[PDB]
Design a protein around this ligand. Structure first.
Ligand SMILES: *[C@H](O)[C@H](C[C@@H]1CCNC1=O)NC(=O)[C@H](CC(C)C)NC(=O)OCc1ccccc1
Ligand SMILES: *[C@H](O)[C@H](C[C@@H]1CCNC1=O)NC(=O)[C@H](CC(C)C)NC(=O)OCc1ccccc1
Ligand SMILES: [Cl-]
Ligand SMILES: [Cl-]
Ligand SMILES: [Cl-]
Ligand SMILES: [K+]
Ligand SMILES: [K+]
Ligand code: NA
Ligand code: NA
Lengths: 304, 304
């Protein structure tokens, strides 16, 4: 038993990280088959980043202006093109460690593992949720751009995120692997708002079920509620509305615990109104919303 | 910026996990050079585990009674021996993916990454601290034994933990890679006490410095204190005593922030006495003690 925020094993993705340098700017690239993917602001100087015209900047760059380094070795860049906010560098060598992979655009509320890298080398791995406002709460320093987010299913890596920038609130923003930002953001160093960050209600309920599965049961109260009545509570607290789709997704955890989803909703309502009175749930004094129902099921069933 | 619990990249350790089966019992083994390391209770039936005589049980086992599987392939077991609570199986093939490695016995308060595995296959990675009472708060199900804890320095994996059991409190216990338990525990399915779990004071202070580095400063008060006066506070709350060795270890974070260590101690004292009044520090409503000063420095400096 026990319940922990846990990332996927990172080995398949470590084999795909390279270093990309253009002029003075160095960042990380993702090397799959004979293409290296990286954020297009690798072509910017510090001044450019304030207000970049990426088309005009890129037109001054040739293949040989991109230095791509895999460990000790230089890759030869044989072509380049910009797709939305990502740059694709064609190289003369297919990555021999390319795993089976696909590119996915993930939904708000879903989670993924970040392999944080600097200079093409992995530094650590942690789990993030795509928030409903399309930001993530990561840990990123200068040089971390091009670090990627991913999920594993069996032996297929599903890449879903590439890191580009930090917002004034300290949260993080990036694109899918087609270079399209999650959220309303642009890759320019100007102040940008993500708007109200709402709580992923279905995830909090999955985490409460995780707490019950692991013996934490003090917060279970004697009430039930309805969906419409709960959502009137939910929206007062900037929680996302709960739907029958969410109820069904929670079905298996509801069955494991014998706790109806609407019974758990009433338990959540009283936590929202009364707080936790200094108690803890799974070692936290906040309600946690970055575990999906699948995250709870896979952790509590030993999926490999 | 941002601060997250993050594990080391797991790729070097994934290449060392195998499956070990003896009779009906299956668990994980660590394959380095021509030796596989695993918990000795792989030789027990369910009944044996209640009160095992490991010497007598092992004497009924021959090399061919240990099935060791690396992916699809069987390894041939050419010898075996018990070292404390671990079994060493000599195999006829050196692991071609053996990384540079060593075995270390870690100190209470230090952290490490767990690569949780089932059936020889990695399932996820998370960070743990060796608590002062020599338990860890992990996430482990049946079949997870032989999962290992490790740290990376450059390209050397330092293995420090192998998983063996769960205590009645839900915390976890295991050995170093020489098979010696951390703590007073024995590998028998009988109720065992770990005793009072005290808080890793130097780690809480490192985490408060991490909070300041990342812009969280509301808890800084106008007081200072002394070591002896703080430790009178510390011991009332089951915190570990703070020493000049800890002060010096915190030196670099103290310098980064301009906050004297004893000033931060006085800030901690008021948090201990008054609580957090519903505020949060680095997104937590508890004081976090599973980040070492080195963990904070390495995260806040981009070490790879
Ligand atoms: C890519 O490595 C970088 C990641 C920033 C590093 C600071 N924390 C991060 O997540 N991205 C940028 O520097 C980005 C470049 C623009 C052309 C989009 N600019 C940026 O994020 O400005 C915010 C910022 C905050 C704190 C320090 C530096 C920049
Ligand atoms: C090795 O896979 C296993 C790990 C236990 C799995 C339950 N959670 C764990 O961490 N170890 C044992 O089953 C251990 C074997 C003895 C010979 C030491 N026994 C054990 O941990 O008993 C506690 C327990 C708690 C909950 C379920 C099963 C066992
Ligand atoms: Cl665009
Ligand atoms: Cl965490
Ligand atoms: Cl022993
Ligand atoms: K209820
Ligand atoms: K102070
Ligand atoms: Na897209
Ligand atoms: Na030892």
């Amino acid at each position: 038993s026990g319940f922990r925020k846990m990332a996927f094993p990172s080995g398949k993705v470590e084999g795909c990280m390279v270093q990309v340098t253009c002029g003075t700017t160095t960042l990380n690239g993702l090397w799959l088959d004979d293409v290296v993917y990286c954020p297009r602001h690798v072509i910017c100087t510090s001044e450019d980043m304030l207000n970049p015209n990426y088309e005009d900047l890129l037109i001054r760059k040739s293949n040989h202006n991109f230095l791509v380094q895999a460990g000790n070795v230089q890759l030869r860049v044989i072509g380049h093109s910009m797709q939305n906010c990502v740059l694709k560098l064609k190289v003369d060598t297919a990555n021999p460690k390319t795993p089976k992979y696909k590119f996915v655009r993930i939904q708000p509320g879903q989670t993924f593992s970040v392999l944080a890298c600097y200079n093409g080398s992995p530094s650590g791995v942690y789990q993030c949720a795509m928030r409903p406002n399309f930001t993530i709460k990561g840990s990123f320093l200068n040089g971390s751009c091009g670090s990627v987010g991913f999920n594993i299913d069996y032996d297929c890596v599903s890449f879903c995120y590439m890191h580009h920038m930090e917002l004034p609130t300290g949260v993080h923003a990036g694109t899918d692997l087609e270079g399209n930002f999650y959220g309303p953001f642009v890759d320019r160093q100007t102040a940008q708002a993500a708007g109200t960050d709402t709580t992923i209600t279905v995830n909090v309920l999955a985490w409460l079920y995780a707490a019950v599965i692991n013996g934490d049961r003090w917060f279970l109260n004697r009430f039930t509620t309805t969906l419409n009545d709960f959502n009137l509570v939910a929206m007062k607290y900037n929680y996302e509305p709960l739907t029958q789709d969410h109820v069904d997704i929670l079905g298996p955890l509801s069955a494991q615990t014998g706790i109806a989803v609407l019974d758990m909703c009433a338990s959540l309502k009283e936590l929202l109104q009364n707080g936790m009175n200094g108690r803890t749930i799974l070692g936290s004094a906040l309600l946690e919303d970055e575990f999906t129902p699948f995250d709870v099921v896979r952790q509590c069933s030993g999926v490999t």
